Design a protein around this ligand. Structure first.
Ligand SMILES: CNC(=O)c1cc(-n2ncc3cc(Nc4c(F)cccc4Cl)c(CN4CCC4)cc32)cs1
Length: 346
């Protein structure tokens, strides 16, 4: 009779449509754990995420709404697309939880980062991250918080970005990973498209180094790590800083910054064949153009896609997809509950 059934998964209750069978945990993270399942209607493995009362506060509310709305503005194989959205609640009044369903993938990008990867796979993951980003930007979406824990891959080396970035405070123990954020974001500057190239550079760099490039308890520690390694930015970069942030960054110790062979020595790269020796120097060259503090000197998404490290994968039908609601206003719980509910059933 009921379309739904409930099963305890790790600790959470999943109330899902009966088409989804054999639920099992695959990890948690931020708002809501996720489960793998077999979808008996489509005869394929899916991943199901529970948003628990996403209207309970503005942080959870804004991004649940945002991501439901933005889902319909993108259509690209390196960007999440949902297979199903449902609530087991029957009315706005009883409405509580949202479930999102997508293709089951094989691994998060964090796991892939810990592997020794050839150049063909590294360059292909990067190519795909750049294609996704480009799709987002062409749709008017600038991410600003790309990070590996929100990127997933299949065994065939294919890759999907799962979130849409920045639009705060939550009483939960959940903690925000900030290490992949551009200087523009760390320092509250204007930004444009290539804010996201920085994050691609932090990921690429960590794939080679197998350590977070710019760790830290908060932006104070993080900024220090940026300047220690890349050096103090030029005066031209300083003039773009708001007067108070500007005074702070100019009074930090001036650092020369290490060269990019020093920051990513040859020992980190496969370099046994001539082919691999060349790919190493191409990898480092691209890194040196992405990990650039000043966005006015940082390479763009389009030029990074033409870099020799990356463009061996270039296909016109992959980079230029056809492009295609705005509410970040402060709402109460009630407004947000109805806004999300409506999107859930359109
Ligand atoms: C044997 N396979 C495995 O072990 C693995 C497979 C996965 N995988 N595949 C798809 C997927 C999706 C998300 N979330 C999600 C969802 F589930 C449904 C709709 C929208 C979204 Cl955003 C998560 C959770 N991650 C992302 C940060 C925590 C992991 C995911 C990774 S490991």
């Amino acid at each position: 009779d009921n379309q739904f059934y409930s099963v305890e998964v790790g600790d959470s209750t999943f109330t899902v449509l009966k088409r989804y069978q054999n639920l099992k945990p695959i990890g948690s993270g931020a708002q809501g754990i996720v489960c793998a399942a077999y979808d008996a209607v489509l005869d394929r493995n899916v991943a199901i995420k529970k948003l628990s009362r996403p209207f309970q506060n503005q942080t959870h509310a804004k991004r649940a709404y945002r991501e439901l709305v933005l889902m319909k503005c993108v259509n690209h194989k390196n960007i999440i697309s949902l297979l199903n959205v449902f609530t087991p609640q029957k009315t706005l009044e009883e409405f509580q939880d949202v479930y999102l369903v997508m293709e089951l993938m094989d691994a998060n990008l964090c796991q892939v980062i810990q592997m020794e990867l050839d150049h063909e796979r590294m360059s292909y993951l990067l190519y795909q991250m750049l294609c996704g980003i480009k799709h987002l930007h062409s749709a008017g979406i600038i991410h600003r918080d790309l990070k590996p824990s929100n990127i997933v891959v299949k065994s065939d080396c294919t890759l999907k970005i799962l979130d849409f970035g920045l639009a705060s405070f939550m009483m939960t123990p959940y903690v925000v990973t900030r290490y992949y954020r551009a200087p523009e974001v760390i320092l509250g500057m204007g930004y444009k498209e290539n804010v996201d190239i920085w994050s691609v550079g932090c990921i690429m760099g960590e794939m080679v180094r197998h350590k977070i490039l710019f760790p830290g308890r908060d932006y104070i520690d993080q900024w220090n790590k940026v300047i220690e390694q890349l050096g103090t930015p030029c005066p031209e970069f300083m003039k773009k800083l708001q007067p108070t942030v500007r005074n702070y960054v100019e009074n930090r110790p001036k650092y020369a910054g290490l060269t990019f062979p020093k920051l990513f020595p040859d020992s980190l790269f496969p370099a046994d064949s001539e082919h691999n020796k060349l790919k190493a120097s191409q990898a480092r060259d691209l890194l040196s153009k992405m990990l650039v503090i000043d966005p006015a000197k940082r390479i763009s998404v389009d030029d990074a896609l033409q870099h020799p490290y990356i463009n061996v994968w270039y296909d016109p039908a992959e980079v230029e997809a056809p492009p295609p609601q705005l509410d970040e206003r402060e709402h109460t719980i009630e407004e947000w509950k109805e806004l999300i509910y409506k999107e859930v059933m359109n």
